[PDB]
Design a protein around this ligand. Structure first.
Ligand SMILES: Nc1ncnc2c1ncn2[C@@H]1O[C@H](COP(=O)(O)OP(=O)(O)NP(=O)(O)O)[C@@H](O)[C@H]1O
Ligand SMILES: [Mg+2]
Lengths: 369, 280
């Protein structure tokens, strides 16, 4: 069995029953920059994956998936061919394929994804699961609320005995690169200029290696204005080291206070409680004690701690707020599926080529839910 | 070179399937307009591709009419060029009644395609049934959605077709790529097995089945059945058939003047009253 988890930026694919993805490469397609392009390409019209990452020079890189929704189906087909044939070196005829999707995906897209697998690649069987839901299953649970913060968009997804609650799914337009953007904006406001994609990837690294969430903001703000225990140095490649202090945490405060980015939307802490409230009064209790972190932007140290503190001040007195953050929540969406596709109980749950060839791609809203 | 390929194109070489003019330096409108007409009565080319060759809207018009005058090309790749929606649209209308082309790509142009140009492409290709893959990123939710559903309903015609013939009585059927991942050992974490026992245990809540619902509200039959009341007398007691008199449906003066009078009316002829109250 195969597992493919597509992302707004990074793609991870691999065999089911496996520990981890064998294939993790960027979800990008590169085409020449412009002008007298030639020199660079040979007889190719585009590049795919980590060769498109290495030739960023004359390539204008584009993502088929934007905010977790497939916006480019042709490049989506390109990426999928690249995966089976080039990256995974396997024939999609010889394998069933579990694919993933974002919360609040259109039915239209669910169907094209369906049809592409069956007509183009000719897969024996296939299934499509909501990514948030696949993250809960990895945590060893079937019920809970999953906070999913990826690269483009954030999602809080209440889940009830295996099925995501559409009425209660809340969505926030702030994630990964908004923080990268933000860090860039303030590290620049303070000196060094960061404007190019080559220098942008080092702000990603200043971020991921040196950023954290404070439990109490106004305190850590003042700790830093008071002493320098919060400072840390970072070595750039040219050898000039720079020092951030209050920016280590002013960056992820965006998650908790979107106004720092001039947003009128509420933080990830309320976006999780608010969701639970539109859920059933008989599951809120198990929701609160099963909030699960998923995605790369939840990897900040102290984000679980801050969350609990926030969602206890929002919740009623008597509930226990347990916030679970798996150590591998970068590949969890995959892992949760890798385990699902392997469960003997799941084999009857696929979608047969027959069933498709009889009913068309439409059978996927009923077979998958 | 170029001419070695072009030679074969009008030579009808039973062996040149691909015409690859990708990243080819110093190519003209006319030198591509030649190719366009050089393929205008060709039969052995399934793939014509000109990527990253300063192509323009004349090359497009060239290719466009060439399209409505060619039945063997399945794929056109006009990528990374300098073509406007004025040219893109040329190729679009041609396809209004071109039932061979199956893939077309115009990614990575000079400028933004526009939007009237973008909503054009969708309403335009709306009466096309043959195109399977359209290589372009719409920057508009409306069009992009309208579009994807079309390439779905074109391709379902393939699925419907195979349904008729394939089985029904056919007997049977250059720097670094910074790559640090993780080696494996399989799966020790578990306990989602029980929901799958539960997910087998349940589902298909309420009612859903059948092949096609041509008739009315294939109602779940709890309503219809539980609302017993509608079940008028059956099996026993009165026989209630209302065969009556000897009238029929040709011209009628009383009823059709009545219709004429019913049509010529309005609440503007009625004496004003009122009904706002709710009574305790
Ligand atoms: N340790 C870390 N701390 C903070 N941020 C991180 C860390 N590791 C990765 N990231 C960020 O994670 C983001 C992208 O990861 P991820 O959320 O997995 O993307 P994705 O799943 O491909 N997109 P989507 O499918 O839309 O969620 C980037 O902005 C990274 O900067
Ligand atoms: Mg994701």
């Amino acid at each position: 069995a195969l597992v493919v988890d597509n992302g707004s930026g990074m793609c991870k694919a691999g065999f089911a029953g496996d520990d981890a993805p064998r294939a993790v490469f960027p979800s990008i397609v590169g085409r020449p920059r412009h002008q007298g392009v030639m020199v660079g390409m040979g007889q190719k019209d585009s590049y795919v994956g980590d060769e498109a990452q290495s030739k960023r020079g004359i390539l204008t890189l584009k993502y088929p998936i934007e905010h977790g929704i497939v916006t480019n189906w042709d490049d989506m087909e390109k990426i999928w061919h690249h995966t089976f044939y080039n990256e995974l070196r396997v024939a999609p005829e010889e394998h069933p394929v579990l694919l993933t999707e974002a919360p609040l995906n259109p039915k239209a897209n669910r169907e094209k994804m369906t049809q592409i697998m069956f007509e183009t690649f000719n897969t024996p069987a296939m299934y499509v699961a909501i990514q948030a839901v696949l993250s809960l299953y990895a945590s060893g649970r079937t019920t809970g609320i999953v906070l999913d913060s990826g690269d483009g968009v954030s999602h809080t997804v209440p889940i009830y005995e295996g099925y995501a609650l559409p009425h209660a799914i809340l969505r926030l337009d702030l994630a990964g690169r908004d923080l990268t953007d933000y860090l860039m904006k303030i590290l620049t406001e303070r000196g060094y200029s960061f404007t190019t994609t080559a220098e942008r990837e080092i702000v990603r690294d200043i971020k991921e290696k040196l950023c954290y969430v404070a439990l109490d903001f106004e305190q850590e703000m003042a700790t830093a204005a008071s002493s320098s225990s919060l400072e840390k140095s970072y070595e750039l490649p040219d050898g000039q080291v720079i020092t951030i202090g209050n920016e280590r945490f002013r960056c992820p405060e965006a998650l908790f206070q979107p106004s720092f980015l001039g947003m009128e939307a509420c933080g990830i802490h309320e976006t999780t409680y608010n969701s639970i409230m539109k859920c059933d009064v008989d599951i809120r209790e198990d929701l609160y004690a099963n909030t699960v972190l998923s995605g790369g932007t939840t990897m900040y140290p102290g984000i679980a701690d801050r969350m609990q503190k926030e969602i206890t001040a929002l919740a009623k007195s008597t509930m226990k707020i347990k916030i679970i953050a798996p150590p591998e929540r970068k590949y969890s969406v995959w892992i949760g599926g890798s385990i699902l596709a392997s469960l003997s109980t799941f084999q009857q749950m696929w979608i047969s080529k027959q069933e498709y060839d009889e009913s068309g791609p439409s059978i996927v809203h009923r077979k998958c839910f | 070179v170029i001419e070695d390929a072009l030679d074969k194109i009008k030579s009808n070489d039973p062996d040149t399937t691909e015409v690859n003019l990708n990243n080819i330096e110093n190519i003209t409108t006319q030198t591509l307009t030649r190719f366009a007409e050089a393929l205008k009565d060709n039969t052995v080319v399934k793939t014509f591709s000109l990527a990253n060759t300063h192509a323009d809207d004349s090359a497009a018009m060239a290719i466009a009419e060439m399209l409505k005058v060619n039945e063997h090309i399945t794929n056109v790749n006009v990528e990374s060029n300098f073509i406007t929606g004025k040219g893109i649209l040329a190729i679009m209308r041609a396809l209004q009644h071109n039932t061979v082309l199956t893939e077309l790509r115009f990614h990575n142009q000079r400028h933004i395609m526009g939007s009237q140009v973008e909503m054009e492409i969708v309403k335009l290709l709306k009466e096309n049934t043959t195109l399977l893959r359209l290589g372009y990123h719409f920057e508009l939710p409306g069009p992009r959605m309208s579009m994807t559903s079309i390439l779905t309903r074109n391709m379902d015609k393939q699925r419907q077709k195979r349904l008729q013939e394939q089985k029904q009585q056919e007997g049977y059927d250059p720097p670094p790529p910074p790559p640090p991942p993780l080696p494996e050992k399989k799966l020790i974490t578990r306990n989602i097995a029980e929901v799958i026992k539960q997910q087998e245990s349940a589902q298909r809540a309420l009612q859903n089945g059948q092949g096609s619902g041509s008739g009315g509200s294939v109602g779940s039959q709890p309503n219809s059945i539980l609302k017993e009341i509608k079940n008028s007398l059956r099996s026993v007691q009165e026989k209630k058939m209302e065969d009556s008199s000897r009238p029929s449906t040709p011209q009628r003066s009383a009823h059709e003047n009545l219709m004429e009078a019913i049509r010529g009316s309005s609440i503007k002829q009625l004496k004003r009253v009122e009904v706002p109250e709710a009574l305790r």
